[PDB]
Amino acid sequence: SAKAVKFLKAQRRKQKNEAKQATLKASTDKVDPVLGRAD
Amino acid sequence: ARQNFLGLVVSQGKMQKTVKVRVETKVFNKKINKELFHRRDYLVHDEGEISREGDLVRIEATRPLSKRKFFAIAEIIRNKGQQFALYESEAQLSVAKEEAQKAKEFLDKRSVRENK
Amino acid sequence: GKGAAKYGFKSGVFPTTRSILKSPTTKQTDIINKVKSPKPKGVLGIGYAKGV
RNA sequence: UAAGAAUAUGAUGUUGGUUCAGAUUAAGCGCUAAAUAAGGACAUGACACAUGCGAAUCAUACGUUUAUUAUUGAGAUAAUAAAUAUGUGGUGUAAACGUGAGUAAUUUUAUUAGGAAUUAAUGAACUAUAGAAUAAGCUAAAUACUUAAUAUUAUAUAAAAAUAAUUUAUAUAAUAAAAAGGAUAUAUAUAUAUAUAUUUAUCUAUAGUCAAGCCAAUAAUGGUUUAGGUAGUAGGUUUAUUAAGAGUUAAACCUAGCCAACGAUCCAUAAUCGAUAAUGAAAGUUAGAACGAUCACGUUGACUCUGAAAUAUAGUCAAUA
RNA sequence: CAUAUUAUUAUCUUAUUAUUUAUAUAAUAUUUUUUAAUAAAUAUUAUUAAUUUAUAUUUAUUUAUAUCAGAAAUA
Ligand SMILES: [Mg+2]
Ligand SMILES: [Mg+2]
Ligand SMILES: [Mg+2]
Ligand SMILES: [Mg+2]
Ligand SMILES: [Mg+2]
Ligand SMILES: [Mg+2]
Ligand SMILES: [Mg+2]
Ligand SMILES: [Mg+2]
Ligand SMILES: [Mg+2]
Ligand SMILES: [Mg+2]
Ligand SMILES: [Mg+2]
Ligand SMILES: [Mg+2]
Ligand SMILES: [Mg+2]
Ligand SMILES: [Mg+2]
Ligand SMILES: [Mg+2]
Ligand SMILES: [Mg+2]
Ligand SMILES: [Mg+2]
Ligand SMILES: [Mg+2]
Ligand SMILES: [Mg+2]
Ligand SMILES: [Mg+2]
Ligand SMILES: [Mg+2]
Ligand SMILES: [Mg+2]
Ligand SMILES: [Mg+2]
Ligand SMILES: [Mg+2]
């Protein structure tokens, strides 16, 4: 019960951090190294 | 006196008040009979968060500050990291100014050809 | 036992000699002046810089 | 202070492995063996253990018990002799001894002329000085236990500088926390008290010794046919706890980090080291039995008390026998 | 396919211990209001002992968390 509550708190925290890692990887500039910016 | 090391800030801005400092020391490898550089990365406390990646800084021993932090920036020897950020910010406006200027010049030259 | 060559070929050890006076005394002006000297900065700096 | 040899090939040169000559052992085995001196001796089952020993001592802590003399009338009290530790007490067993299971580093080892949190109104047990050692209650009595009496840090003011803090001095605040008497002499007085002393004890404070706690840097086996690992995880901010830092442990909030092909994580294996032993020309390699150093454990696991320090060879609970 | 040991858990059970809520005509001390048997001097007045009462220190009771160890499952 208390172990389950703590486990789910930790699971939510870990999943939030993984999702934010992905979003940070997505929140980058991503300029084309060959052609540069579009215009 | 306290342990002091000289190193390059190789990772900043990813942890609150913590940077990563790469230090190198001279060691003798007897297996190859050579004086080598032994490299290591330290997690270092940065009160004020003044350091940036690429700065040459002197780190000094302190009390344990976390599980892995035992050193703090004691002095910024060379501050190339701050200069890089300054030029990054300045170039944004600097470029755009003449980018608009020369676009104006191009359009004016086009119009001059148009009315010939 | 070739390590003994590093210590005058003396095998075995003695307990390290204790110091009668465990801190520098006041009648030693060289150490007093050395500690009470300005502290260097830069590559061989000892301490925190002015603005840090 | 560095030596090679035999064996390929029809023969030659070369590559290449195999083996040998040397030293040695914590050695076993076969055959053999005189005396003495010295150094060692379960490497394997941290497997199970018959039996006997390895931690007692103090009677001058308090209580008991006798015998003679003296006074008092079954006893009482003195003096002198003794016996009593199957009664209450104190001190002593955190050491030493043995062992190498675990441990590959989350607290282990080694090194440094390393640190801070600037390690506590801590002495454990001897020095050197000082000052104390007061009442009840409880036990049969007490140096046994209770209760009560009395004896550095935080503030603020300045000073400086080894300075962006520390140190110094002062004034307050609370510190504010103890104890113990026995053995002999005598000296007073009225067996009773008392006053001195000589003894050995008790407590407190300062300093010194001896010592403890924590952290950093570097190093410490094999397997990536173990390649991704990690959610207290990496970091920040507080609170709790600690003498003391720190996701060390507990709670809350955040940020999204941290480690890793110069090998992470995982797995296996192993006590570690030397001015110790072996070997070699030496770099090194091997051992870690003996001598010494360090660690860990005392049938297995966790927790707790006391204590400066213990998950103690203690105690509690459980497991095994 | 069978036997064994080690580890883990959003699982179950759980000695012990430490925290943690809440409850006791629950106890032992101090504080009251009262009820009882003694004392003494001349209606008592004080003592010892029970009733009620409210602060500490314990035990019993439970609430919650963690925990040796088992069980189940997974490796
Ligand atoms: Mg921190
Ligand atoms: Mg042949
Ligand atoms: Mg040979
Ligand atoms: Mg002999
Ligand atoms: Mg053995
Ligand atoms: Mg052995
Ligand atoms: Mg006696
Ligand atoms: Mg006795
Ligand atoms: Mg021991
Ligand atoms: Mg030993
Ligand atoms: Mg071992
Ligand atoms: Mg008394
Ligand atoms: Mg006492
Ligand atoms: Mg951790
Ligand atoms: Mg903390
Ligand atoms: Mg937490
Ligand atoms: Mg590996
Ligand atoms: Mg082993
Ligand atoms: Mg080895
Ligand atoms: Mg040995
Ligand atoms: Mg031995
Ligand atoms: Mg032990
Ligand atoms: Mg045994
Ligand atoms: Mg054990």
Side-chain angles (χ1 to χ4, degrees), chain B residues 58-96:
Chain B
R58 197 183 79 247
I59 66 172
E60 188 156 50
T62 64
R63 53 159 188 127
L65 300 169
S66 74
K67 193 197 158 178
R68 292 190 62 208
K69 287 168 65 171
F70 310 105
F71 288 80
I73 297 89
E75 173 172 298
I76 307 295
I77 304 293
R78 182 66 60 84
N79 62 95
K80 288 182 179 292
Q82 303 174 6
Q83 298 170 1
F84 290 161
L86 275 162
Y87 306 134
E88 181 65 26
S89 72
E90 293 165 3
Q92 292 275 346
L93 306 165
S94 297
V95 166

Side-chain angles (χ1 to χ4, degrees), chain B residues 1-2 4 6 50 58 60 62 72-75 77, chain C residues 40-52:
Chain B
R2 299 215 192 96
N4 274 294
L6 183 63
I50 58 168
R58 197 183 79 247
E60 188 156 50
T62 64
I73 297 89
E75 173 172 298
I77 304 293
Chain C
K41 299 275 163 273
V43 298
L44 294 174
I46 301 299
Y48 292 91
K50 181 60 66 175
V52 179

